[PDB]
Write a protein that binds this ligand. Structure first.
Ligand code: 5AH
Lengths: 99, 99
C-alpha cells in the first residue's frame, strides 16, 4: 500500500495475541510499545527522543504482524506516549520512503 | 528517490543558505531544528516526544530545501537531539510510505 502523510501513518498491528494501533515511524531506530506482557527474557534499555530518555524492557525475537505483513524482531516495552513501529521492523515488511 | 530504512533516513537540507543534515521522520508532526538563527518574529510552542516535552520557537513561512526539493513552511527551533523533518514538510515534497 501507499500511505500518504497528511495524517499520522497509523496502522493496526498484531502482537502477543493482541491487536494494537501503532505509528509507522521512520525516525525511530527501534519499536517501542506501551506497557504489555511479552514472552521470554528481557534486558533493560534507555532510549532517547525529544524530551529525553525513558527506561524500557527489551524483548528479542518477537513475532509481530504489521498491516498484514509478518516479521520478527526486537520490541521494547515501556512508558512511551504512543505505540511506535521503528526501522528495525519497517525494513522487514519492505517499507520505504518515496518522493 | 526511494529510501530504504536499514540506516537512518538522513538527508541534506538547505536553510538560511546553509547545509545541514536532517532526519526524514514520518512519526513527527512538525519539523524541529537544533538551535540556529531565523528571520522574523516567532511564537511559542510545546512539543512532546518519548522523553517528555520541550519548548521551541516557531517560525512560519520559512524557505527550506530538502534533498533538493523546495518547501516553505513552519520550522521549529529548540533543544532537539537531532534535526527532524516532520510531516508538515514531508507532505510538501510529496513523500509517502510504501510497502
Ligand atoms: C505529536 O507529537 C509528535 O509528532 N512529536 C514528534 C515526536 O517526538 N515523534 N516521535 C519520534 C521522534 C524521534 O524519531 C526523533 C529522534 C530521532 C533520533 C534521535 C533522537 C530523536 C525519536 O524520538 N526517535 C527515537 C525513538 C523512538 C521510539 C523508539 C526508539 C527510539 C530511539 C530514537 O530513534 C514519536 C512520538 C509521537 C508522539 C508523541 C506524543 C507525546 C505526547 C503526547 C502525545 N504524543 C511522542 C513520540 C516531535 C519530533 C516532537 C515533533
Amino acid at each position: 500500500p501507499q500511505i500518504t502523510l497528511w495524517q499520522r501513518p497509523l496502522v493496526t498491528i498484531k502482537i502477543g495475541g493482541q491487536l494494537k494501533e501503532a505509528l509507522l515511524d521512520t525516525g525511530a531506530d527501534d519499536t517501542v510499545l506501551e506497557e504489555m506482557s511479552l514472552p521470554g527474557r528481557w534486558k533493560p534499555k534507555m532510549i532517547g527522543g525529544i524530551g529525553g530518555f525513558i527506561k524500557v524492557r527489551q524483548y528479542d525475537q518477537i513475532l509481530i504482524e504489521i498491516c498484514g505483513h509478518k516479521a520478527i524482531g526486537t520490541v521494547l516495552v515501556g512508558p512511551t506516549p504512543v505505540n511506535i513501529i521503528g526501522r528495525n521492523l519497517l525494513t522487514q515488511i519492505g517499507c520505504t520512503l518515496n518522493f
